Amino acid sequence: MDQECIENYAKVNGIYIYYKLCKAPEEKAKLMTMHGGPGMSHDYLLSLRDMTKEGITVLFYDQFGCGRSEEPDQSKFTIDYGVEEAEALRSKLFGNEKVFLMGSSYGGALALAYAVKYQDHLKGLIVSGGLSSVPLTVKEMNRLIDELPAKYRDAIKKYGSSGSYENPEYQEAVNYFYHQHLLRSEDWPPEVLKSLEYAERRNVYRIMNGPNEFTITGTIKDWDITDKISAIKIPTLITVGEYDEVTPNVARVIHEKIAGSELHVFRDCSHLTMWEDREGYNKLLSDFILKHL
Ligand SMILES: *[C@](O)(CCl)[C@@H](N)Cc1ccccc1
To answer: Is Protease a UniProt keyword of this protein?
Structure first.
């Protein structure tokens, strides 16, 4: 069964980053995880921790300016910097071993940007609810907004149009959206709540993402590397939910570009598929890693 994890606060390429590694028994493969946001934390991905009894070691770590890690210079708020951070961590920790990469949401996109440069260091890639193009995901989310009942749809196009995010009606619509496309549940896990809490307390989510999940005005609103991800040749497991805020259509684009890549859609699921179907999610990412051992 579980055997706790080794927590540390090491110095990466310039800044102090927090990480939590859980390895063995009978380790077969090592796996690094990248939370979403931007500006969240490993916390909400702690369900993937169950894969250790399946011989999978997991590396949970808060990215720059996230969770328990120090915030770098405002200019370092880019995805290209996260990639340099990831590689530095994998190396000054695992040496020159080939590790499996797992990215969730923004982490998925980051995970992709990683493979585009350091795929040779990876043995496999897992992109869950991720994206390769922000403008695309934005276009997809807008549809979801229009598909929401007028009671909330209008509130999102009104108060979200006058900068009135502190409005209760609007905040009411944001919630309905989250309980529909972010996480389908009434008893949200603490891990998620902590990562969400970390998003409102730091500055990354603010400066890179925006007010909320469906109102991106940060510094990635134009990010798009679709014409780059085609160069990835390693085994890729792309998962996405049915009601996923980052539609399976956006997951489809990634599927095309990556040859031989798998694509799995979780019915009755949304964005955080980690808690909606923990056993099935982990099982899928587990067998994926074990076959491409
Ligand atoms: C994920 O990182 C949430 Cl865990 C998500 N915010 C990424 C994203 C979605 C839509 C637009 C930009 C980023």
So the answer is: yes
What is the CATH number assigned to the segment(s) 1-293? 3.40.50.1820
> Which residues 6+ apart lie within 8 Å of 199 measured at CB?
37, 39, 40, 205
Q: Minimal CA–CA distance to 62: which of 29, 28, 120, 15?
A: 15
Catalytic residue check, 161: no
Ligand 1 centroid to Cα of residue 59, in Å, is 21
| Structure-token pair, residue 77 | 């708020």
| Catalytic-residue membership of 271 | yes
Give the angle 268-110-87 at the CA atoms, nearest 5°: 130
Which of 85, 50, 287, 15 minimizes the C-alpha distance to 191?
Answer: 50
Has 244 been annotated as catalytic? yes
Domain boundaries, the chain: 1-293
Name the structure determination technique: X-ray
Among 205, 246, 270, which residue has the most ligand 1 atoms within 8 Å of its CB, making it the best to mutate?
Answer: 246
Ligand 1 within 6 A of CB of 106: yes
Burial of 144 (0-12, 13-18, 19+ CB in 10 A): middle
Nearest 5 degrees, angle CA 282-CA 96-CA 7? 55
β-sheet bridge partners, residue 16: 11
What is the stated resolution of the deposited model, in angstroms?
2.4
CA 111 to chain centroid, in Å, comes to 8
- Written as one letter, the residue type at 124 is G
Residue (of 178, 190, 187) closest to 244 by Cα position: 178
Distance of CA 216 from the midpoint of ligand 1 (Å): 9
